[PDB]
GROMACS .gro file of C-alpha atoms in nm:
model
  515
    1UNK     CA    1  -1.473  -3.604  -1.793
    2UNK     CA    2  -1.434  -3.367  -1.547
    3UNK     CA    3  -1.755  -3.458  -1.472
    4UNK     CA    4  -1.636  -3.855  -1.367
    5UNK     CA    5  -1.365  -3.685  -1.146
    6UNK     CA    6  -1.598  -3.550  -0.985
    7UNK     CA    7  -1.838  -3.851  -0.980
    8UNK     CA    8  -1.593  -3.976  -0.765
    9UNK     CA    9  -1.515  -3.734  -0.535
   10UNK     CA   10  -1.858  -3.660  -0.457
   11UNK     CA   11  -1.920  -4.053  -0.369
   12UNK     CA   12  -1.561  -4.098  -0.186
   13UNK     CA   13  -1.686  -3.771   0.043
   14UNK     CA   14  -1.966  -3.909   0.072
   15UNK     CA   15  -1.849  -4.273   0.234
   16UNK     CA   16  -1.618  -4.011   0.474
   17UNK     CA   17  -1.882  -3.910   0.619
   18UNK     CA   18  -2.126  -4.112   0.805
   19UNK     CA   19  -2.346  -3.889   0.951
   20UNK     CA   20  -2.476  -3.787   0.636
   21UNK     CA   21  -2.436  -3.334   0.648
   22UNK     CA   22  -2.734  -3.064   0.725
   23UNK     CA   23  -2.647  -2.708   0.776
   24UNK     CA   24  -2.821  -2.590   1.043
   25UNK     CA   25  -3.093  -2.401   1.119
   26UNK     CA   26  -3.218  -2.220   1.336
   27UNK     CA   27  -3.540  -2.440   1.498
   28UNK     CA   28  -3.252  -2.637   1.745
   29UNK     CA   29  -2.996  -2.419   1.807
   30UNK     CA   30  -3.244  -2.223   1.981
   31UNK     CA   31  -3.426  -2.586   2.155
   32UNK     CA   32  -3.019  -2.611   2.292
   33UNK     CA   33  -2.969  -2.253   2.364
   34UNK     CA   34  -3.359  -2.321   2.524
   35UNK     CA   35  -3.292  -2.745   2.698
   36UNK     CA   36  -2.843  -2.734   2.742
   37UNK     CA   37  -2.678  -2.379   2.876
   38UNK     CA   38  -2.458  -2.627   2.989
   39UNK     CA   39  -2.304  -2.746   2.628
   40UNK     CA   40  -2.019  -2.626   2.497
   41UNK     CA   41  -2.090  -2.306   2.148
   42UNK     CA   42  -2.377  -2.197   2.408
   43UNK     CA   43  -2.205  -1.821   2.309
   44UNK     CA   44  -2.185  -1.920   1.944
   45UNK     CA   45  -2.543  -2.022   1.936
   46UNK     CA   46  -2.654  -1.701   2.070
   47UNK     CA   47  -2.407  -1.559   1.804
   48UNK     CA   48  -2.622  -1.768   1.558
   49UNK     CA   49  -2.985  -1.665   1.632
   50UNK     CA   50  -2.852  -1.343   1.704
   51UNK     CA   51  -2.751  -1.328   1.286
   52UNK     CA   52  -2.987  -1.512   1.167
   53UNK     CA   53  -3.378  -1.313   1.265
   54UNK     CA   54  -3.480  -1.111   0.975
   55UNK     CA   55  -3.507  -0.783   0.969
   56UNK     CA   56  -3.902  -0.811   1.028
   57UNK     CA   57  -3.825  -0.915   1.388
   58UNK     CA   58  -3.899  -1.296   1.280
   59UNK     CA   59  -3.658  -1.608   1.174
   60UNK     CA   60  -3.667  -1.822   0.895
   61UNK     CA   61  -3.906  -1.842   0.529
   62UNK     CA   62  -4.234  -1.685   0.376
   63UNK     CA   63  -4.538  -1.816   0.437
   64UNK     CA   64  -4.548  -1.828   0.717
   65UNK     CA   65  -4.219  -2.076   0.767
   66UNK     CA   66  -4.086  -1.842   1.008
   67UNK     CA   67  -4.323  -1.956   1.296
   68UNK     CA   68  -4.142  -2.233   1.429
   69UNK     CA   69  -3.835  -2.101   1.402
   70UNK     CA   70  -3.992  -1.748   1.583
   71UNK     CA   71  -4.067  -1.956   1.871
   72UNK     CA   72  -3.817  -2.153   1.881
   73UNK     CA   73  -3.621  -1.789   1.930
   74UNK     CA   74  -3.812  -1.647   2.131
   75UNK     CA   75  -3.831  -1.930   2.394
   76UNK     CA   76  -3.545  -2.011   2.440
   77UNK     CA   77  -3.387  -1.616   2.470
   78UNK     CA   78  -3.711  -1.544   2.759
   79UNK     CA   79  -3.517  -1.845   2.906
   80UNK     CA   80  -3.142  -1.692   2.893
   81UNK     CA   81  -3.291  -1.378   3.006
   82UNK     CA   82  -3.391  -1.548   3.278
   83UNK     CA   83  -3.109  -1.729   3.390
   84UNK     CA   84  -2.791  -1.696   3.520
   85UNK     CA   85  -2.431  -1.636   3.248
   86UNK     CA   86  -2.337  -2.032   3.179
   87UNK     CA   87  -1.989  -1.746   3.075
   88UNK     CA   88  -1.833  -1.406   2.974
   89UNK     CA   89  -2.122  -1.312   2.746
   90UNK     CA   90  -2.023  -1.173   2.388
   91UNK     CA   91  -2.408  -1.050   2.356
   92UNK     CA   92  -2.521  -0.826   2.661
   93UNK     CA   93  -2.892  -0.893   2.800
   94UNK     CA   94  -2.983  -0.515   2.583
   95UNK     CA   95  -2.928  -0.721   2.269
   96UNK     CA   96  -3.060  -1.069   2.339
   97UNK     CA   97  -3.340  -0.901   2.474
   98UNK     CA   98  -3.358  -0.622   2.112
   99UNK     CA   99  -3.407  -0.930   1.949
  100UNK     CA  100  -3.595  -1.153   2.202
  101UNK     CA  101  -3.800  -0.824   2.184
  102UNK     CA  102  -3.844  -0.781   1.793
  103UNK     CA  103  -3.920  -1.176   1.807
  104UNK     CA  104  -4.207  -1.105   2.018
  105UNK     CA  105  -4.342  -0.819   1.804
  106UNK     CA  106  -4.332  -1.070   1.453
  107UNK     CA  107  -4.510  -1.314   1.695
  108UNK     CA  108  -4.749  -1.054   1.777
  109UNK     CA  109  -4.806  -0.886   1.415
  110UNK     CA  110  -4.827  -1.155   1.189
  111UNK     CA  111  -4.797  -1.533   1.232
  112UNK     CA  112  -4.934  -1.662   1.441
  113UNK     CA  113  -5.253  -1.525   1.242
  114UNK     CA  114  -5.095  -1.614   0.952
  115UNK     CA  115  -5.038  -1.950   0.807
  116UNK     CA  116  -4.890  -2.241   0.910
  117UNK     CA  117  -4.748  -2.494   0.681
  118UNK     CA  118  -4.754  -2.879   0.720
  119UNK     CA  119  -4.449  -2.870   0.883
  120UNK     CA  120  -4.334  -3.220   1.093
  121UNK     CA  121  -4.506  -3.178   1.494
  122UNK     CA  122  -4.578  -2.868   1.448
  123UNK     CA  123  -4.898  -2.974   1.610
  124UNK     CA  124  -4.654  -3.080   1.932
  125UNK     CA  125  -4.380  -2.812   1.798
  126UNK     CA  126  -4.610  -2.462   1.871
  127UNK     CA  127  -4.782  -2.517   2.124
  128UNK     CA  128  -4.546  -2.571   2.356
  129UNK     CA  129  -4.358  -2.287   2.257
  130UNK     CA  130  -4.646  -2.066   2.305
  131UNK     CA  131  -4.709  -2.128   2.642
  132UNK     CA  132  -4.325  -2.202   2.769
  133UNK     CA  133  -4.346  -1.768   2.585
  134UNK     CA  134  -4.622  -1.706   2.758
  135UNK     CA  135  -4.431  -1.815   3.134
  136UNK     CA  136  -4.174  -1.667   3.100
  137UNK     CA  137  -4.374  -1.350   2.989
  138UNK     CA  138  -4.569  -1.300   3.247
  139UNK     CA  139  -4.248  -1.422   3.540
  140UNK     CA  140  -4.111  -1.124   3.376
  141UNK     CA  141  -4.128  -0.771   3.557
  142UNK     CA  142  -4.106  -0.377   3.408
  143UNK     CA  143  -3.654  -0.488   3.517
  144UNK     CA  144  -3.677  -0.655   3.221
  145UNK     CA  145  -3.391  -0.480   2.986
  146UNK     CA  146  -3.515  -0.331   2.716
  147UNK     CA  147  -3.836  -0.235   2.602
  148UNK     CA  148  -3.893  -0.636   2.700
  149UNK     CA  149  -3.938  -0.503   3.014
  150UNK     CA  150  -4.328  -0.372   2.837
  151UNK     CA  151  -4.409  -0.744   2.732
  152UNK     CA  152  -4.487  -0.800   3.074
  153UNK     CA  153  -4.750  -0.941   3.135
  154UNK     CA  154  -4.879  -1.058   2.825
  155UNK     CA  155  -5.031  -1.396   2.691
  156UNK     CA  156  -5.002  -1.424   2.324
  157UNK     CA  157  -5.178  -1.651   2.128
  158UNK     CA  158  -5.272  -1.812   1.752
  159UNK     CA  159  -5.659  -1.926   1.562
  160UNK     CA  160  -5.463  -2.161   1.408
  161UNK     CA  161  -5.591  -2.524   1.413
  162UNK     CA  162  -5.288  -2.673   1.521
  163UNK     CA  163  -5.134  -2.437   1.799
  164UNK     CA  164  -5.430  -2.513   1.998
  165UNK     CA  165  -5.200  -2.763   2.226
  166UNK     CA  166  -5.567  -3.021   2.342
  167UNK     CA  167  -5.349  -3.324   2.109
  168UNK     CA  168  -5.016  -3.176   2.311
  169UNK     CA  169  -5.111  -3.282   2.631
  170UNK     CA  170  -5.370  -3.532   2.515
  171UNK     CA  171  -5.007  -3.751   2.439
  172UNK     CA  172  -4.824  -3.585   2.746
  173UNK     CA  173  -5.117  -3.725   2.949
  174UNK     CA  174  -5.072  -4.067   2.743
  175UNK     CA  175  -4.698  -4.115   2.800
  176UNK     CA  176  -4.714  -4.096   3.177
  177UNK     CA  177  -4.793  -4.440   3.089
  178UNK     CA  178  -4.706  -4.569   2.811
  179UNK     CA  179  -4.409  -4.444   2.525
  180UNK     CA  180  -4.463  -4.186   2.329
  181UNK     CA  181  -4.455  -4.402   1.956
  182UNK     CA  182  -4.153  -4.449   1.825
  183UNK     CA  183  -4.201  -4.161   1.540
  184UNK     CA  184  -4.230  -3.901   1.750
  185UNK     CA  185  -3.910  -3.965   1.910
  186UNK     CA  186  -3.801  -3.652   1.667
  187UNK     CA  187  -3.991  -3.463   1.901
  188UNK     CA  188  -3.983  -3.455   2.271
  189UNK     CA  189  -3.880  -3.160   2.315
  190UNK     CA  190  -4.188  -3.064   2.265
  191UNK     CA  191  -4.361  -3.345   2.524
  192UNK     CA  192  -4.186  -3.271   2.778
  193UNK     CA  193  -3.878  -2.964   2.823
  194UNK     CA  194  -3.647  -3.261   3.073
  195UNK     CA  195  -3.873  -3.631   3.060
  196UNK     CA  196  -3.805  -3.931   2.904
  197UNK     CA  197  -4.066  -4.029   2.795
  198UNK     CA  198  -4.001  -4.439   2.643
  199UNK     CA  199  -3.806  -4.292   2.386
  200UNK     CA  200  -3.477  -4.504   2.386
  201UNK     CA  201  -3.151  -4.356   2.247
  202UNK     CA  202  -2.980  -4.573   1.937
  203UNK     CA  203  -2.759  -4.760   2.111
  204UNK     CA  204  -2.513  -4.949   1.837
  205UNK     CA  205  -2.352  -4.898   1.544
  206UNK     CA  206  -2.170  -4.526   1.563
  207UNK     CA  207  -2.183  -4.175   1.513
  208UNK     CA  208  -2.473  -4.147   1.703
  209UNK     CA  209  -2.503  -4.350   1.946
  210UNK     CA  210  -2.744  -4.198   2.256
  211UNK     CA  211  -2.904  -3.941   2.012
  212UNK     CA  212  -3.279  -3.947   2.096
  213UNK     CA  213  -3.497  -4.063   1.704
  214UNK     CA  214  -3.173  -3.843   1.578
  215UNK     CA  215  -3.278  -3.508   1.726
  216UNK     CA  216  -2.999  -3.264   1.895
  217UNK     CA  217  -3.276  -3.110   2.099
  218UNK     CA  218  -3.443  -3.436   2.156
  219UNK     CA  219  -3.195  -3.594   2.260
  220UNK     CA  220  -3.146  -3.263   2.525
  221UNK     CA  221  -3.531  -3.303   2.622
  222UNK     CA  222  -3.342  -3.717   2.764
  223UNK     CA  223  -3.086  -3.628   2.902
  224UNK     CA  224  -3.227  -3.408   3.155
  225UNK     CA  225  -3.069  -3.023   3.284
  226UNK     CA  226  -2.819  -3.211   3.493
  227UNK     CA  227  -2.643  -3.471   3.239
  228UNK     CA  228  -2.344  -3.740   3.333
  229UNK     CA  229  -2.083  -3.629   3.118
  230UNK     CA  230  -2.001  -4.019   3.062
  231UNK     CA  231  -2.335  -4.012   2.919
  232UNK     CA  232  -2.314  -4.094   2.507
  233UNK     CA  233  -2.610  -3.824   2.401
  234UNK     CA  234  -2.401  -3.557   2.581
  235UNK     CA  235  -2.090  -3.713   2.314
  236UNK     CA  236  -2.316  -3.669   1.973
  237UNK     CA  237  -2.434  -3.322   2.056
  238UNK     CA  238  -2.091  -3.246   2.194
  239UNK     CA  239  -1.991  -3.427   1.774
  240UNK     CA  240  -2.277  -3.225   1.651
  241UNK     CA  241  -2.223  -2.887   1.772
  242UNK     CA  242  -1.840  -2.933   1.708
  243UNK     CA  243  -1.948  -2.936   1.391
  244UNK     CA  244  -2.025  -2.649   1.318
  245UNK     CA  245  -1.888  -2.477   1.569
  246UNK     CA  246  -2.283  -2.428   1.795
  247UNK     CA  247  -2.510  -2.411   1.611
  248UNK     CA  248  -2.669  -2.745   1.519
  249UNK     CA  249  -2.943  -2.928   1.240
  250UNK     CA  250  -3.249  -3.023   1.398
  251UNK     CA  251  -3.229  -3.428   1.181
  252UNK     CA  252  -2.865  -3.577   1.272
  253UNK     CA  253  -2.731  -3.865   1.073
  254UNK     CA  254  -2.886  -3.895   0.833
  255UNK     CA  255  -2.648  -4.151   0.632
  256UNK     CA  256  -2.974  -4.387   0.503
  257UNK     CA  257  -3.123  -4.055   0.333
  258UNK     CA  258  -2.790  -3.954   0.152
  259UNK     CA  259  -2.669  -4.209   0.109
  260UNK     CA  260  -2.984  -4.372  -0.173
  261UNK     CA  261  -3.025  -3.991  -0.277
  262UNK     CA  262  -2.639  -3.984  -0.400
  263UNK     CA  263  -2.644  -4.290  -0.587
  264UNK     CA  264  -3.008  -4.252  -0.732
  265UNK     CA  265  -2.887  -3.909  -0.870
  266UNK     CA  266  -2.544  -3.990  -0.962
  267UNK     CA  267  -2.731  -4.309  -1.144
  268UNK     CA  268  -2.964  -4.081  -1.274
  269UNK     CA  269  -2.668  -3.867  -1.437
  270UNK     CA  270  -2.510  -4.115  -1.721
  271UNK     CA  271  -2.152  -4.051  -1.569
  272UNK     CA  272  -1.940  -4.360  -1.589
  273UNK     CA  273  -1.827  -4.440  -1.159
  274UNK     CA  274  -1.771  -4.688  -0.936
  275UNK     CA  275  -1.991  -4.686  -0.646
  276UNK     CA  276  -1.746  -4.766  -0.321
  277UNK     CA  277  -1.911  -5.089  -0.163
  278UNK     CA  278  -1.864  -4.945   0.142
  279UNK     CA  279  -2.202  -4.714   0.020
  280UNK     CA  280  -2.351  -5.081  -0.048
  281UNK     CA  281  -2.255  -5.179   0.195
  282UNK     CA  282  -2.424  -4.956   0.423
  283UNK     CA  283  -2.755  -4.947   0.228
  284UNK     CA  284  -2.720  -5.357   0.312
  285UNK     CA  285  -2.674  -5.399   0.617
  286UNK     CA  286  -2.913  -5.137   0.785
  287UNK     CA  287  -3.257  -5.281   0.538
  288UNK     CA  288  -3.456  -5.474   0.688
  289UNK     CA  289  -3.772  -5.723   0.674
  290UNK     CA  290  -3.900  -5.340   0.743
  291UNK     CA  291  -3.777  -5.158   0.582
  292UNK     CA  292  -3.571  -4.825   0.627
  293UNK     CA  293  -3.561  -4.527   0.745
  294UNK     CA  294  -3.311  -4.227   0.733
  295UNK     CA  295  -3.120  -4.328   0.945
  296UNK     CA  296  -3.071  -4.598   1.217
  297UNK     CA  297  -3.321  -4.431   1.594
  298UNK     CA  298  -3.596  -4.354   1.286
  299UNK     CA  299  -3.874  -4.600   1.204
  300UNK     CA  300  -3.896  -4.786   0.920
  301UNK     CA  301  -4.035  -4.541   0.614
  302UNK     CA  302  -4.193  -4.701   0.291
  303UNK     CA  303  -3.986  -4.373   0.123
  304UNK     CA  304  -3.629  -4.400   0.292
  305UNK     CA  305  -3.735  -4.822   0.160
  306UNK     CA  306  -3.797  -4.773  -0.222
  307UNK     CA  307  -3.508  -4.501  -0.241
  308UNK     CA  308  -3.275  -4.727  -0.126
  309UNK     CA  309  -3.410  -5.046  -0.239
  310UNK     CA  310  -3.344  -4.892  -0.625
  311UNK     CA  311  -3.079  -4.750  -0.534
  312UNK     CA  312  -2.883  -5.127  -0.387
  313UNK     CA  313  -3.064  -5.244  -0.769
  314UNK     CA  314  -3.023  -5.038  -0.946
  315UNK     CA  315  -2.605  -5.046  -0.840
  316UNK     CA  316  -2.616  -5.432  -0.913
  317UNK     CA  317  -2.752  -5.521  -0.575
  318UNK     CA  318  -3.094  -5.650  -0.622
  319UNK     CA  319  -3.335  -5.733  -0.372
  320UNK     CA  320  -3.726  -5.834  -0.362
  321UNK     CA  321  -3.864  -5.473  -0.261
  322UNK     CA  322  -4.097  -5.766  -0.027
  323UNK     CA  323  -4.022  -5.451   0.227
  324UNK     CA  324  -4.256  -5.209   0.046
  325UNK     CA  325  -4.610  -5.392   0.074
  326UNK     CA  326  -4.674  -5.390   0.421
  327UNK     CA  327  -4.702  -4.973   0.356
  328UNK     CA  328  -4.973  -5.034   0.081
  329UNK     CA  329  -5.285  -4.925   0.097
  330UNK     CA  330  -5.573  -4.874  -0.119
  331UNK     CA  331  -5.512  -4.691  -0.446
  332UNK     CA  332  -5.168  -4.571  -0.349
  333UNK     CA  333  -4.915  -4.671  -0.062
  334UNK     CA  334  -4.807  -4.490   0.262
  335UNK     CA  335  -4.508  -4.360   0.421
  336UNK     CA  336  -4.531  -4.436   0.766
  337UNK     CA  337  -4.768  -4.674   0.863
  338UNK     CA  338  -5.004  -4.426   0.996
  339UNK     CA  339  -5.074  -4.155   0.823
  340UNK     CA  340  -5.341  -3.876   0.772
  341UNK     CA  341  -5.161  -3.749   0.393
  342UNK     CA  342  -5.020  -3.865   0.149
  343UNK     CA  343  -4.678  -3.867  -0.001
  344UNK     CA  344  -4.635  -3.777  -0.369
  345UNK     CA  345  -4.304  -3.827  -0.349
  346UNK     CA  346  -4.315  -4.143  -0.116
  347UNK     CA  347  -4.514  -4.315  -0.408
  348UNK     CA  348  -4.278  -4.128  -0.718
  349UNK     CA  349  -3.997  -4.396  -0.551
  350UNK     CA  350  -4.217  -4.611  -0.448
  351UNK     CA  351  -4.319  -4.633  -0.861
  352UNK     CA  352  -3.909  -4.727  -0.963
  353UNK     CA  353  -3.825  -4.895  -0.690
  354UNK     CA  354  -4.136  -5.173  -0.786
  355UNK     CA  355  -4.048  -5.081  -1.151
  356UNK     CA  356  -3.708  -5.112  -1.174
  357UNK     CA  357  -3.777  -5.455  -0.982
  358UNK     CA  358  -3.966  -5.614  -1.213
  359UNK     CA  359  -3.766  -5.471  -1.499
  360UNK     CA  360  -3.387  -5.600  -1.391
  361UNK     CA  361  -3.603  -5.971  -1.234
  362UNK     CA  362  -3.871  -6.025  -1.490
  363UNK     CA  363  -3.958  -6.347  -1.351
  364UNK     CA  364  -4.109  -6.144  -1.067
  365UNK     CA  365  -4.383  -5.918  -1.320
  366UNK     CA  366  -4.691  -6.045  -1.155
  367UNK     CA  367  -4.549  -6.012  -0.797
  368UNK     CA  368  -4.575  -5.597  -0.779
  369UNK     CA  369  -4.712  -5.511  -1.154
  370UNK     CA  370  -5.031  -5.470  -1.009
  371UNK     CA  371  -4.910  -5.241  -0.772
  372UNK     CA  372  -4.689  -5.043  -1.010
  373UNK     CA  373  -5.041  -4.963  -1.295
  374UNK     CA  374  -5.169  -4.835  -0.967
  375UNK     CA  375  -4.912  -4.555  -0.843
  376UNK     CA  376  -4.960  -4.451  -1.148
  377UNK     CA  377  -5.294  -4.427  -1.184
  378UNK     CA  378  -5.333  -4.248  -0.883
  379UNK     CA  379  -5.002  -4.036  -0.933
  380UNK     CA  380  -5.165  -3.916  -1.265
  381UNK     CA  381  -5.462  -3.801  -1.096
  382UNK     CA  382  -5.220  -3.596  -0.840
  383UNK     CA  383  -5.092  -3.395  -1.079
  384UNK     CA  384  -5.245  -2.976  -1.021
  385UNK     CA  385  -5.484  -2.859  -1.289
  386UNK     CA  386  -5.147  -2.678  -1.381
  387UNK     CA  387  -4.914  -2.987  -1.449
  388UNK     CA  388  -4.717  -2.936  -1.056
  389UNK     CA  389  -4.710  -3.152  -0.852
  390UNK     CA  390  -4.694  -3.074  -0.435
  391UNK     CA  391  -4.553  -3.296  -0.102
  392UNK     CA  392  -4.555  -3.332   0.242
  393UNK     CA  393  -4.212  -3.333   0.235
  394UNK     CA  394  -4.045  -3.098   0.109
  395UNK     CA  395  -4.220  -2.679   0.072
  396UNK     CA  396  -4.077  -2.681  -0.347
  397UNK     CA  397  -4.361  -2.780  -0.592
  398UNK     CA  398  -3.991  -2.834  -0.824
  399UNK     CA  399  -3.921  -3.167  -0.614
  400UNK     CA  400  -4.237  -3.269  -0.607
  401UNK     CA  401  -4.236  -3.181  -0.967
  402UNK     CA  402  -3.959  -3.397  -1.049
  403UNK     CA  403  -4.029  -3.686  -0.871
  404UNK     CA  404  -4.355  -3.707  -1.026
  405UNK     CA  405  -4.271  -3.688  -1.332
  406UNK     CA  406  -3.916  -3.890  -1.314
  407UNK     CA  407  -4.114  -4.160  -1.214
  408UNK     CA  408  -4.366  -4.186  -1.468
  409UNK     CA  409  -4.131  -4.103  -1.734
  410UNK     CA  410  -3.975  -4.402  -1.679
  411UNK     CA  411  -4.216  -4.662  -1.551
  412UNK     CA  412  -4.560  -4.526  -1.577
  413UNK     CA  413  -4.635  -4.617  -1.990
  414UNK     CA  414  -4.774  -4.430  -2.244
  415UNK     CA  415  -5.119  -4.367  -2.067
  416UNK     CA  416  -4.912  -4.159  -1.861
  417UNK     CA  417  -4.722  -3.910  -2.098
  418UNK     CA  418  -4.921  -3.660  -2.131
  419UNK     CA  419  -4.867  -3.532  -1.790
  420UNK     CA  420  -4.504  -3.554  -1.806
  421UNK     CA  421  -4.541  -3.311  -2.107
  422UNK     CA  422  -4.728  -3.116  -1.907
  423UNK     CA  423  -4.459  -3.117  -1.600
  424UNK     CA  424  -4.296  -3.018  -1.849
  425UNK     CA  425  -4.466  -2.725  -1.996
  426UNK     CA  426  -4.487  -2.621  -1.632
  427UNK     CA  427  -4.141  -2.617  -1.538
  428UNK     CA  428  -4.034  -2.383  -1.975
  429UNK     CA  429  -4.395  -2.121  -1.755
  430UNK     CA  430  -4.191  -2.095  -1.398
  431UNK     CA  431  -3.815  -2.095  -1.518
  432UNK     CA  432  -3.763  -1.741  -1.383
  433UNK     CA  433  -3.516  -1.518  -1.612
  434UNK     CA  434  -3.123  -1.562  -1.482
  435UNK     CA  435  -3.191  -1.988  -1.564
  436UNK     CA  436  -3.280  -2.015  -1.225
  437UNK     CA  437  -3.667  -2.203  -1.089
  438UNK     CA  438  -3.694  -2.159  -0.711
  439UNK     CA  439  -4.018  -2.143  -0.477
  440UNK     CA  440  -3.891  -1.799  -0.306
  441UNK     CA  441  -3.574  -1.760  -0.539
  442UNK     CA  442  -3.385  -1.929  -0.780
  443UNK     CA  443  -3.211  -2.236  -0.543
  444UNK     CA  444  -2.926  -2.433  -0.699
  445UNK     CA  445  -3.138  -2.714  -0.583
  446UNK     CA  446  -3.426  -2.641  -0.730
  447UNK     CA  447  -3.311  -2.540  -1.102
  448UNK     CA  448  -3.140  -2.851  -1.095
  449UNK     CA  449  -3.467  -3.107  -1.013
  450UNK     CA  450  -3.614  -2.881  -1.370
  451UNK     CA  451  -3.286  -2.947  -1.546
  452UNK     CA  452  -3.313  -3.321  -1.501
  453UNK     CA  453  -3.713  -3.314  -1.555
  454UNK     CA  454  -3.585  -3.165  -1.905
  455UNK     CA  455  -3.336  -3.371  -2.016
  456UNK     CA  456  -3.460  -3.696  -1.891
  457UNK     CA  457  -3.799  -3.650  -2.040
  458UNK     CA  458  -3.680  -3.484  -2.400
  459UNK     CA  459  -3.762  -3.677  -2.743
  460UNK     CA  460  -3.708  -3.642  -3.081
  461UNK     CA  461  -4.044  -3.486  -3.081
  462UNK     CA  462  -3.966  -3.213  -2.798
  463UNK     CA  463  -4.029  -2.856  -2.882
  464UNK     CA  464  -3.694  -2.640  -2.922
  465UNK     CA  465  -3.743  -2.477  -2.686
  466UNK     CA  466  -3.668  -2.777  -2.406
  467UNK     CA  467  -3.313  -2.816  -2.408
  468UNK     CA  468  -3.228  -2.363  -2.477
  469UNK     CA  469  -3.454  -2.387  -2.098
  470UNK     CA  470  -3.226  -2.614  -1.964
  471UNK     CA  471  -2.922  -2.427  -2.070
  472UNK     CA  472  -3.057  -2.128  -1.918
  473UNK     CA  473  -3.050  -2.418  -1.659
  474UNK     CA  474  -2.748  -2.498  -1.633
  475UNK     CA  475  -2.533  -2.155  -1.702
  476UNK     CA  476  -2.717  -2.059  -1.367
  477UNK     CA  477  -2.554  -2.376  -1.171
  478UNK     CA  478  -2.233  -2.309  -1.328
  479UNK     CA  479  -2.277  -1.921  -1.264
  480UNK     CA  480  -2.285  -1.956  -0.826
  481UNK     CA  481  -2.307  -2.198  -0.627
  482UNK     CA  482  -2.214  -2.191  -0.270
  483UNK     CA  483  -2.263  -2.501  -0.060
  484UNK     CA  484  -2.300  -2.305   0.284
  485UNK     CA  485  -2.616  -2.172   0.154
  486UNK     CA  486  -2.823  -2.387   0.012
  487UNK     CA  487  -3.169  -2.261   0.171
  488UNK     CA  488  -3.311  -2.519   0.399
  489UNK     CA  489  -3.665  -2.662   0.190
  490UNK     CA  490  -3.712  -3.002   0.350
  491UNK     CA  491  -3.948  -3.084   0.571
  492UNK     CA  492  -3.870  -3.137   0.929
  493UNK     CA  493  -3.953  -2.892   1.310
  494UNK     CA  494  -3.807  -2.570   1.056
  495UNK     CA  495  -3.718  -2.674   0.674
  496UNK     CA  496  -3.361  -2.830   0.660
  497UNK     CA  497  -3.146  -2.834   0.387
  498UNK     CA  498  -2.917  -3.150   0.320
  499UNK     CA  499  -2.613  -3.042   0.160
  500UNK     CA  500  -2.538  -3.312  -0.016
  501UNK     CA  501  -2.784  -3.424  -0.189
  502UNK     CA  502  -2.891  -3.074  -0.317
  503UNK     CA  503  -2.473  -3.140  -0.444
  504UNK     CA  504  -2.604  -3.451  -0.578
  505UNK     CA  505  -2.855  -3.346  -0.842
  506UNK     CA  506  -2.573  -3.051  -0.887
  507UNK     CA  507  -2.344  -3.243  -1.023
  508UNK     CA  508  -2.641  -3.505  -1.278
  509UNK     CA  509  -2.824  -3.206  -1.386
  510UNK     CA  510  -2.515  -3.046  -1.473
  511UNK     CA  511  -2.323  -3.438  -1.630
  512UNK     CA  512  -2.702  -3.418  -1.802
  513UNK     CA  513  -2.719  -3.093  -1.940
  514UNK     CA  514  -2.359  -3.145  -2.085
  515UNK     CA  515  -2.218  -2.857  -1.947
   0.00000   0.00000   0.00000
């Protein structure tokens, strides 16, 4: 019961947060510096950019995850250096120029030619920023501060197909005559620095009226260079930056995503608690015949829809999951209506919503029974030779593997048990020496996923290694927990950290581990 109290405190904190919690990252913080110098916290955002720069000149994570945020930071710094000051600077033109030049070096020396991860909207965001950087470079003179003058007239290029710019040009031309698709409102700033393009600010429920695609950057682009100070979008930008003292996340709010993920983690934990009615009411109000999004102001998607249906049904509010049928395709389910790459985690979550439904409403077993077993087919067929899965929405194989193995363990039937064991084997094989797991380092989030996987799929027949591994995982979680520094691993513009989501995952792990 110490963790019962923790569960109740987590639920209460979630109720009291109608935004959800996403930590700031470099991408949108830089976008606001470039697009919204009028906004409070501008100097703080410049400070954040200076502080967050890596010693190799880049910003962000390894393996090419530095490309988008470095582009954003460099463009913002060039834009700032070319303008008059918003207020008395704490960082001199020389300080900013040093950061900028080192960012240019990192772009030229490896990032532009390196891997390009499939972050969201990268085919728009990356060429957009590269073109603005080149424009700024052409305008530099040799009297630019520091070594930045030496960069005057440089043209940066990239061999990467995603940086080509042809698709961006097409969408820019199209949006002179037709509205930007709803799913791209989140990336409006790539299309235009100042314009609307048929994107519509959220109107209706607080707390984010005026936001465009739940993106601070897109909202800045929509409002333009000199917005009306009474505009709702201005209040959204003010609120978001104030929450963190200047820096901003790339997606906010995430309320429905957070509510469902928190509730599903707690349901999995085995802890006793009462779900506050306010969470279940929020989710029900948001759910429609077309499903639900991560938050109001975004288009519906099947991952969020499936998670929300599962969360509601596990807490006594069962709804027929018919909204998921819109996303049925040949052999699997899509996440959005139109997509190039399927999501493994989405199909896992759909398997849970459907499987759980037919369990709790046995009369509907014929309605979804087939879909359940074909998603089973597909998840099994998409497991990698080493026992892991990967997913389009997340940088970590620990997320994807936990999602798929846990869905298959509970709803895949005995044909799927071999795959689950291969996933647990992969978990044992990938554990770090200190008991943690993670892609680039041991993390709370990734460790939590593996502890859950191992505990929830344990059988009487499981070797002793399973319990000891999960125990060492729990030891790692107990040894260090710093939510303020949880790394961002979820794909958006760069990669973001849904902090409360991670805290809920940690709680579930520790409860299941008996820590």
